[PDB]
Amino acid sequence: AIHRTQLWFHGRISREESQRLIGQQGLVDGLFLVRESQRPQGFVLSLCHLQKVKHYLILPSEEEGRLYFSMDDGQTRFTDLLQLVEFHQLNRGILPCLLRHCCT
Amino acid sequence: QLWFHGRISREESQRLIGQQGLVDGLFLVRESQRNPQGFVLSLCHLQKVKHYLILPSEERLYFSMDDGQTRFTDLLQLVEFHQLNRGILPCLLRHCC
């Protein structure tokens, strides 16, 4: 719920709307936002790379018995979305580029 | 010889692993459908079964779960390696289904 205090968080918007928003802010490489998946406790990171918006699914899992999030089916795990974003500003991980600029 | 289950479905593997206790590190290897060349590593972690594709390629024939970053000449070597080391896995393999 802290991700709601983040400006890169757009809550529940469609893929189309996320690509319009990223377009509006100039399709800069590493321009990104995070949003709700249409069908829960799941999210999409929408990221511009080489003038294209790509979409990375972030899925929740439990663990004794607390939720974490992952983009790689649990190989890399995060307590919350802020941790995930902050990680990927510095490390590409599975992404094609760093997260460089917030899409507001 | 135990861990290789020839061909069985994904579900069939989930049921086999299930009825052996859903324990951490409980695992089996199976052939895929298809890719007759392909294989799958069915592994239980947190009472959940996950399935890791094992694909062959050529440089020299090798298998990989991660597109060539980590290579094995055959399935046995991959298994033995992952008894000691996690690799891309969530836990070590230690129990044969």
């Binding site: 979409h55 990375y56 699914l57 790689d72 190989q75 | 694909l55 779960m65």
Partner: peptide
């Protein structure tokens, strides 16, 4: 992978 997304990682 995840069908419909751009996730790429060890499968």
């Amino acid at each position: 992978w995840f069908e419909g997304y751009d996730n790429t990682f060890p499968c």
